[PDB]
Amino acid sequence: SGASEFVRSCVNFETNVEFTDVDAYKKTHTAGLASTFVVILGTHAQLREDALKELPFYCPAVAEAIQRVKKGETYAVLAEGVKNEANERFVRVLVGEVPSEASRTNCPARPDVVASLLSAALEEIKGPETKVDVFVRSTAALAIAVAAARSAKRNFTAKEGLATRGYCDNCVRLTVVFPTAPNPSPSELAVVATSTQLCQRLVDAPTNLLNTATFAEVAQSYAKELGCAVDVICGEELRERGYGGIYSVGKCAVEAPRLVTLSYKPKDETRKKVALVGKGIVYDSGGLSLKPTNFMTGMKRDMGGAAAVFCGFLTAVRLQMPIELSCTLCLAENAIGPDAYRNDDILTLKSGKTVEVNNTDAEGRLVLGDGVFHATHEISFKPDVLVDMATLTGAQGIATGHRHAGIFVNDEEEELSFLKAGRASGETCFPVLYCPEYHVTEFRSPVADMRNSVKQVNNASVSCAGQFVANHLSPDFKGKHIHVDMAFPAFENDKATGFGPALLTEYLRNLR
């Protein structure tokens, strides 16, 4: 308990966001607004459409709010004479103006601002299960769903004794109201929102609750619930079976490292075969390459890639997508102590390749190296596409920024396809240089096949960490490889975003 309550919370998790449309809303609630707190979000043009004037909260104060609000900001009023289920004299209404401007590399619905406007609005909300209606004028259903899900205040939290109430402040029930029946459907969006939120909680959970054993436990429960096969290679079995990357990185920790692989073969298919691999470093101390304090804070999030692929998988099974899937979680804690793998130790990864460790804090690529080899050589099928996701490098932020995950991809078409999924999902990406001939030289070793950390830090370092992982692909793998460095997109204002699963979901959804 403490941990087993967090586990129970993850296993049963439902979202607090529902989706509908204006017409269905008007048919279901003819006895007034079903809430007393309303957020209306749209562009300058969308907020002046005639249809707005027919919405159940519209009144002269709301019309004034629309005239006064600034681009990128909310404007709040108390609306009088709006009939509502609670029979309040006043309904709280917040108008948020979303910019219309978006670059070619961004989601044109600007869910980044939808999220921040919504977040700011929901800070007024005190009480338990307070019903909030969010009327949105965008029809970009998936992107709005994600934004709403990640702003709905279902984050992990241990404030005020909430450890006893599933580490959750249940202060809001959201209803998102689209102009017309959305595509995807409300039931699809709810699955997506659920995965976004579950991912968010997994990431911001501290390591004293979410460690390698409790993460594995969650995945085992989902596997049983979902009818999926699950394989766990734990501890000494990793050493005995030659998985020296993940074993060495994790052997020092109190809870043993584990490679957890889930499988899904759809009922009637199969359109493609995809292996997912995720970096599940439940805490990163640095090992003997110990991080300073201000770089060690937030390293509970170093399992973000594992949470992403796990929650993406979860969504794919739940939406019964016609794709055969494996999901491999590379679970370890990078600890410091007498047993810690050393700067100079030589490891033999499952691939058979030897690695001279020159930075113990470059540990994620080691666990991934064992993971991608496992996915491409040790499992029941031959994937057409391998996607690995990880919170890998500080350099990622320097290169592609806080809101675009860096992608290292060995095929131009599949890179474009993935970027497209980023833009539709709002979980945006951008390419880093793919040039194996320049990256491989950064890991020259005089005593092993390679080192794990670059000789020069100023030579496409996001790409080189990708290349290191690629070095442990099975030599028979002729498929597409998408490597995702999501170090910074995994969080915003010092809170987890749930980034990854929806990007992934949208990508898989569009495979043929």
Q: Which is nearer to its own copies, 39 or 223 (CB)?
A: 39
- Cβ(485)–Cβ(388) under 8 Å? no
**Peptide bond connecting 436 to the previous residue in cis, omega within 30 degrees of 0:** no
Q: Does 89 bind its own copies (CB under 8 A)?
A: yes
Q: Nearest distance from residue 261's CB to its own copies, in Å?
A: 26
Per CB under 5 A, 284 contacts Mn ion: yes
Q: Is 333 in the site for Mn ion (CB under 5 A)?
A: no
Pairing between strand 17-21 and 37-42?
Answer: unpaired
Selection from Mn ion, its own copies, none that 221 binds (CB < 5 to 8 A by kind) is none
Q: Which helix (H) or strand (E) holds 261?
A: strand 258-264
Q: Using CB under 8 A, which of 44, 398, 416, 510 touches its own copies?
A: 398
- Are 484 and 404 within 8 A, CB to CB? no
Tokens of 50: 């005639």
Q: Does 415 bind Mn ion (CB under 5 A)?
A: no
284 assigned ligand-binding residue? yes
Question: Among 30-38, 335-343, 357-365, 496-504, which window interacts with Mn ion (CB under 5 A)?
Answer: 357-365
Interacting residues with its own copies between 94 and 123 (CB under 8 A): 99, 101-106, 110
Binding to its own copies (CB under 8 A): which residues in 253-272? Answer: 253-254
**Interacting residues with its own copies between 348 and 387 (CB under 8 A):** 348, 352, 354, 356, 358-361
Instruction: By CB under 8 A, name the one of 64, 225, 236, 269 that touches its own copies.
Output: 64
344 is in an annotated binding site: no
Residue among 383, 373, 278 at smallest CA distance from 325:
383
ω into residue 184 within 30 of 0, thus cis? yes
Q: Is 44 in the site for its own copies (CB under 8 A)?
A: no
Q: Measuring CA to CA, which residue among 295, 288, 341, 275 is closest to residue 504?
A: 275
Phi and psi at 191, nearest 5°, equal: -65, -45
| Cβ-based nearer residue to its own copies, 15 or 360 | 360
How far is Cα 175 from Cα 25, in angstroms, rounded to an integer? Answer: 10
For Cα atoms 334, 339, 343, give the angle at the middle one, nearest 5 degrees. 70
| Residue 317: C-alpha distances to residues 48, 263, 325 (Å) | 41, 10, 9
Interacting partner of 58 out of its own copies, Mn ion, none (Cβ under 5 to 8 A depending on kind)? none
Q: Do residues 393 and 485 touch, judged by C-beta distance below 8 A?
A: yes
The active-site residue out of 110, 150, 365, 509 is: 365
Find the binder of Mn ion among 361, 384, 442, 506 (CB under 5 A).
Answer: 361
475 binds its own copies (CB under 8 A): no
- Provide the token pair at 414: 């599949």
Which residues are designated catalytic? Answer: 291, 365
Question: Where does this chain bind Mn ion (CB under 5 A)?
Answer: 284, 361, 363
Annotated binding-site residues read: 284, 361, 363
Annotated binding-site residues for Mn(2+) read: 284, 361, 363
